[PDB]
Amino acid sequence: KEGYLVSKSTGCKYECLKLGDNDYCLRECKQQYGKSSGGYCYAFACWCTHLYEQAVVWPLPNKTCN
């Protein structure tokens, strides 16, 4: 129930503000995946957790952007 956050327009997302604990990625997940969802910056952009099992996520080991 996890993955890399897919964009509204661009496929891949834009880059993150802060590594470690932050609000910047958590708000960015909660507006795609519902208010109970979690998230963190994986290295470059926001990754999300505690998702619904039918949720859509970007294929980071098949496509590269960040």
Overall radius of gyration: 11 Å
Strand order of the largest sheet: 1-3-2
Q: Could you spell the SSE succession in H and E letters?
A: EHEE
Structural class: alpha+beta
Alpha carbon gap, first and last residue? 22 Å
Overall number of domains: 1
CATH superfamily caption: Knottin, scorpion toxin-like
Which descriptor suits the 3D outline?
globular
Biggest β-sheet: count, sense, barrel?
Answer: 3 strands, antiparallel
* CATH third-tier fold name: Defensin A-like
CATH architecture classification: 2-Layer Sandwich
> What is the tally of helical segments?
1
Q: Can you count the beta strands?
A: 3
PDB class: toxin
Keywords: CssII, alfa beta scorpion toxin, toxin
Assembly: monomeric
Entry title: Solution Structure of CssII
Keywords:
ion channel impairing toxin; 1 helix; 66 residues; alpha+beta; toxin activity; monomer; three-stranded antiparallel beta sheet; 3 strands; Defensin A-like; voltage-gated sodium channel impairing toxin
Show the helix and strand layout.
Blueprint: E1 3-4, H1 24-33, E2 38-41, E3 46-49
Antiparallel strand pairs: 1-3, 2-3
PDB class: toxin
Keywords: CssII, alfa beta scorpion toxin, toxin
Assembly: monomeric
What does this structure look like?
- This protein has 66 residues and is an alpha+beta fold.
- It has one domain (1-66): Defensin A-like.
- 15% of the residues lie in helices and 15% in strands.
- The chain contains one helix and three strands.
- The longest helix has 10 residues, at 24-33.
- The protein starts with a strand and ends in a 17-residue tail after the last strand.
- One of its GO terms (cellular component) is extracellular space.
- Residues 1-66 form the LCN-type CS-alpha/beta domain.
- This is Beta-mammal toxin Css2.
- Belongs to the long (4 C-C) scorpion toxin superfamily. Sodium channel inhibitor family. Beta subfamily.
- It is found in: Secreted.
